[PDB]
Amino acid sequence: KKHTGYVGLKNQGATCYMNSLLQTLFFTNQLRKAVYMMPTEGDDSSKSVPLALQRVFYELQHSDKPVGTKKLTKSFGWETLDSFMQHDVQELCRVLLDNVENKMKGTCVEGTIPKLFRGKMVSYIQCKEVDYRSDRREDYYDIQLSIKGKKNIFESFVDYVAVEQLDGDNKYDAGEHGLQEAEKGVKFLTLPPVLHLQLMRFMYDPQTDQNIKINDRFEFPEQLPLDEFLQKTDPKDPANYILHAVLVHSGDNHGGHYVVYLNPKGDGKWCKFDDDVVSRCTKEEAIEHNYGGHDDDHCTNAYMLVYIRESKLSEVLQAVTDHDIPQQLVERLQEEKRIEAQK
Ligand SMILES: [Br-]
Ligand SMILES: [Br-]
Ligand SMILES: [Br-]
Ligand SMILES: [Br-]
């Protein structure tokens, strides 16, 4: 527990965003407690993702030394030298959360995942010259925001909700009305208590023919008002979000360094999580110094932000204690440790 109170994770290969993401998920206290509850007795230690995540969280909560992740990577089968380089942070997140959600089904914590991370959107198509619209609900668990050519997060949200023209030769097939010029877009109906925003600095194949990293300046705030992107708003619960995590990458596309900044209590007291080294830092370092740019004469910037709904903040970050871990689970991990101590 060091001197920040918090312990790091081991550098065990090119796992890229993984340690950052695990720290982010660990300090989503409501998720952690829920994960502690899954009926993982009788699971195979080798094969079980639920158990493997239980183990890592337990270690992060009790261990005074940097925590290993080997059994975690084995279980969801990303073990080759470059398996994390072939995926992104939002893909690993879904891998983890889907295993966990699937374990929680039929348990006293079923629905913890959609409760904390799921939001609702309306996807619509409006024809210009014919009276036809098709409104359909879409669920999301995270949001990929465009950052290229945008000054900040507000412009990104503006761009995300911008109307798109559908015109021949890209006309909408309007059924009985045949091919029709249309407008399509999305609107938000609900925003989740925990909001995962990926910033698209790392981008596809610009036709020819690399994955590249955009290191342009992109500003995000400590406090994020999203009411004006909602179809209708609640007077008693405005869509006000507070910045909780800034996942940072330093360098370019090919090779770089991965760090995450957290204020895991939600008070504005920030720590820097750099694998095994956890140290406290200024708020400027966690935030402004991660805007990116090319400024003094800079390759260090956020690719992912986590925001927490201010009204649900002090709950999402609710106290965890030792008693929140069931005895059966404590006993099992303790026995494994004892086996390991036999070398
Ligand atoms: Br390990
Ligand atoms: Br793979
Ligand atoms: Br990205
Ligand atoms: Br720039």
Classify 188 as helix, strand or coil: strand
Instruction: Identify whether residues 147 and 230 lie together within a single domain.
Output: yes
Instruction: Identify whether residues 234 and 267 lie together within a single domain.
Output: yes
In a domain, 1, yes or no: no
Instruction: Identify whether residues 316 and 261 lie together within a single domain.
Output: no
The token duo for 293 is 């740019």
Instruction: Identify whether residues 48 and 110 lie together within a single domain.
Output: yes
Q: Note if 16 is an active site residue.
A: yes
Backbone angles phi, psi at 36, to 5 degrees: -60, -20
The continuous run of DSSP H or E covering 212 comes out as strand 212-213
Instruction: Identify whether residues 332 and 251 lie together within a single domain.
Output: no
In a domain, 201, yes or no: yes
Instruction: Identify whether residues 112 and 258 lie together within a single domain.
Output: no
Classify 205 as helix, strand or coil: coil
CA torsion, ordered 9, 11, 17, 22, to nearest 10 deg: -20
Q: Catalytic one among 93, 177, 249, 257?
A: 257
Q: How far is CA 235 from the centre of its chain?
A: 28
In a domain, 177, yes or no: yes
Those residues whose beta carbon sits under 5 angstroms from the ion ligand 3 are 200, 202, 303
Q: What gap in Å lies between CA 285 and CA 179, rounded to an integer?
A: 53
Q: What gap in Å lies between CA 313 and CA 232, rounded to an integer?
A: 22
Instruction: Identify whether residues 250 and 329 lie together within a single domain.
Output: no
Contact 79, 52 (CB under 8 A): no
Q: How far is CA 151 from the centre of its chain?
A: 22
Instruction: Identify whether residues 71 and 114 lie together within a single domain.
Output: yes
Give just the sign of the alpha carbon dihedral 124, 153, 26, 250: positive
Q: What gap in Å lies between CA 276 and CA 259, rounded to an integer?
A: 11
Q: How far is CA 148 from the centre of its chain?
A: 20
In a domain, 73, yes or no: yes
Closest by Cα among 281, 190, 196 to 25:
196
Ligand with smallest separation from the Cα of 215: 4
Please name every residue paired with 240 in a beta bridge, in sequence order, or none if there are none: 225
Q: What gap in Å lies between CA 119 and CA 309, rounded to an integer?
A: 12
Q: What gap in Å lies between CA 29 and CA 32, rounded to an integer?
A: 5
**Total number of domains in the chain:** 3
Instruction: Identify whether residues 50 and 134 lie together within a single domain.
Output: no
Peptide bond before 324: cis, by omega within 30 degrees of 0?
no
In a domain, 69, yes or no: yes
The DSSP result for 51-66, as a single string, is HHHHHHHHHHHH-SSP
In a domain, 2, yes or no: no
Instruction: Identify whether residues 293 and 154 lie together within a single domain.
Output: yes
- Ligand 2 centre from 70 Cα, in Å? 15
Instruction: Identify whether residues 148 and 269 lie together within a single domain.
Output: yes
- Ligand 4 centre from 217 Cα, in Å? 5
In a domain, 3, yes or no: no
| Residue 340 burial (CB count, 10 A) | 8
CA torsion, ordered 95, 101, 102, 103, to nearest 10 deg: 110
Instruction: Identify whether residues 305 and 317 lie together within a single domain.
Output: no
Backbone angle region of 131, left / alpha / beta, with phi > 0 → left and psi within -120 to 50 → alpha: beta
Q: Å resolution of this model?
A: 2.2
Domain that holds residue 47: 8-118+311-343
Closest by Cα among 17, 12, 64 to 260:
17
